[PDB]
Structure formats: structure tokens, C-alpha cells
Design a protein around this ligand. Structure first.
Ligand SMILES: NS(=O)(=O)c1cc(C(=O)CSc2nc3cc4c(cc3[nH]2)OCCO4)ccc1Cl
Ligand SMILES: [Zn+2]
Length: 257
């Protein structure tokens, strides 16, 4: 029943999921001049050499590319993190137009889209147990702007017409997520939540300062997907982002000056 419309969209979520109004919700606006530079933060460690993708799925909210997370194959560590986080899936949030789409904002600036690479803390043994803990997940967030094509994204864009509607899935093997990463790993970090229901307050957010560029044709293909299932009235999959939420009692830290 939750979704992104007038009747079931973000402003409605708190009725089913009262933690919507909690003390550590995401996303947030990143005010780049109020963020504290922290020389004690470690470089982020992104080890994606042995990543194994399995499938891609339209869930009626976005498309998820899912990875085999049954061994220590694609891991995040270092940065603000203690221990080891394993890659389970990535997805995107995007707009009806290039001027909106991102969930996090930077000095109120909205990007065309935002990529979420979702990882779970290996001390909790799997994703389902991790989301039930305050340090269960690490999400690497990367902004997309429209300009030059990202070649490493085309394999994703090409398969989308095979998962047009809610519930469709396709196998999706040997996709390399290193092809979605910008040059710099300079980041902001703050404690928050899932940005979709159930909105659990289990995420260490790691948001890259440097966006990647994607072409207008690549993002246009995201916009041809559907929120509805096959054989129901077409509702295009656009504006599947949650707006910025109150910062409340939180400091956003930066890895860079
Ligand atoms: N948008 S986000 O905050 O990066 C983020 C989004 C997702 C999604 O897949 C959005 S749709 C979706 N979110 C879920 C969260 C869950 C789940 C099933 C879920 N299905 O199983 C039980 C509780 O956790 C999953 C994890 C994270 Cl971290
Ligand atoms: Zn997300």
C-alpha cells in the first residue's frame, strides 16, 4: 500500500510506520558548510573485485540489482565503519525531470538521480537480522547528474525493458559495480535510516561528494519503467524519492576539507 503518490506517498508513511517521524531519519540536506571535517576518519575501503550479481527485479518502487552475499566477496569497510559490511543489492531513485530525483540534497541542490549500494554488517550474519540493529547497514550513496554517458551503467539500462512492470525479474549476471563509481571517494557521513518503509533506523550513510554523469538517454530509460503490475493502468516509475527530513540532533562529518 505505501508508494510515491498523492494518496500513499512520503507524507502518508508515518501512519503505517510511525518511526517516519523519528530522531534519525533519511534522507537529509547536506549543508556543506556546517559539516565537520574529521582528520581521524579512515579512507573508505571499497572491495568490489569479486562481486557476483544474480538478478534484477522491479518491486513496484524501484529496480534492485541483487548480489550473492553468501561469502565475503564485495565488501565495504574503513571510513566511519567498525568491522565489515557485505554488498547485497543496489537501486536508484530518480525524477520525472532532470531537475529532481535525488533523496539527499547538497546545500539544497537536487540531482537527477541517486544510487544506493546497500551493505549489511557481517556481525549480524544476514540482511534480515542486520536491519533490526542500529549499526546493521552501510549505504554508499552516489549522485547522478545528466551530461556524458556512464558506460558502466549501460548494461543495467539495456535490461530494463525486460522488467517493465511490478514483480518482473530477469537473471543479471557478471555486472561489475566498480563501473558506477566516480574518481574520488571523498564522502560525508551521518547516522540515519532506510529511506523507504519500514524506515528502520539502522543505516550509517556514506554519501560521495563527487557525482557521476549519466546521459539524458540513460535516465530517460529509467523513466519508461512502471510502478504498476502487467495488465493494470500504466503509472510511470518516476519521482520514487523521499524528500529531505529534519536533521534533529545530528552532525554530518566530512572525510575532506
Ligand atoms: N533506499 S535505502 O535506504 O538505500 C534501502 C532501500 C531498500 C529497498 O529494497 C526498498 S523496497 C524494500 N525495503 C526493504 C527493507 C527491508 C525488507 C524488505 C524491503 N523491501 O525486509 C525486512 C525489513 O527490511 C533496502 C535497503 C535499503 Cl538501505
Ligand atoms: Zn534507496
Amino acid at each position: 500500500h505505501w508508494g510515491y503518490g498523492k494518496h500513499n506517498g512520503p507524507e502518508h508513511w508515518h501512519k503505517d510506520f510511525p518511526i517516519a517521524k523519528g530522531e534519525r531519519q533519511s534522507p537529509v540536506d547536506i549543508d556543506t558548510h556546517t559539516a565537520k571535517y574529521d582528520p581521524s576518519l579512515k579512507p573508505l575501503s571499497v572491495s568490489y573485485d569479486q562481486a557476483t550479481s544474480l538478478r534484477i527485479l522491479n518491486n513496484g518502487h524501484a529496480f534492485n540489482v541483487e548480489f550473492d552475499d553468501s561469502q565475503d566477496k564485495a565488501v565495504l569497510k574503513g571510513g566511519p565503519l567498525d568491522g565489515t559490511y557485505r554488498l547485497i543489492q543496489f537501486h536508484f531513485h530518480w525524477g520525472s525531470l532532470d531537475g529532481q530525483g535525488s533523496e539527499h540534497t547538497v546545500d539544497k541542490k537536487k540531482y537527477a538521480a541517486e544510487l544506493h549500494l546497500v551493505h549489511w554488517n557481517t556481525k549480524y550474519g544476514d540482511f534480515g537480522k542486520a536491519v533490526q540493529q542500529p549499526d546493521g547497514l552501510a549505504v554508499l550513496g552516489i549522485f547522478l547528474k545528466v551530461g556524458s554517458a556512464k558506460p558502466g551503467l549501460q548494461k543495467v539500462v539495456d535490461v530494463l525493458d525486460s522488467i517493465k512492470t511490478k514483480g518482473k525479474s530477469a537473471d543479471f549476471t557478471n555486472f561489475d559495480p566498480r563501473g558506477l563509481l566516480p574518481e574520488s571517494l571523498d564522502y560525508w557521513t551521518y547516522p540515519g535510516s532506510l529511506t523507504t518503509p519500514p524506515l528502520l533506523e539502522c543505516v550509517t550513510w556514506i554519501v560521495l561528494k563527487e557525482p557521476i554523469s549519466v546521459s539524458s538517454e540513460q535516465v530517460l530509460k529509467f523513466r519508461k519503467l512502471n510502478f504498476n503490475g502487467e495488465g493494470e493502468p500504466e503509472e510511470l516509475m518516476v519521482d520514487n524519492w523521499r524528500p529531505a527530513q529534519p536533521l534533529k540532533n545530528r552532525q554530518i562529518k566530512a572525510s575532506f576539507k
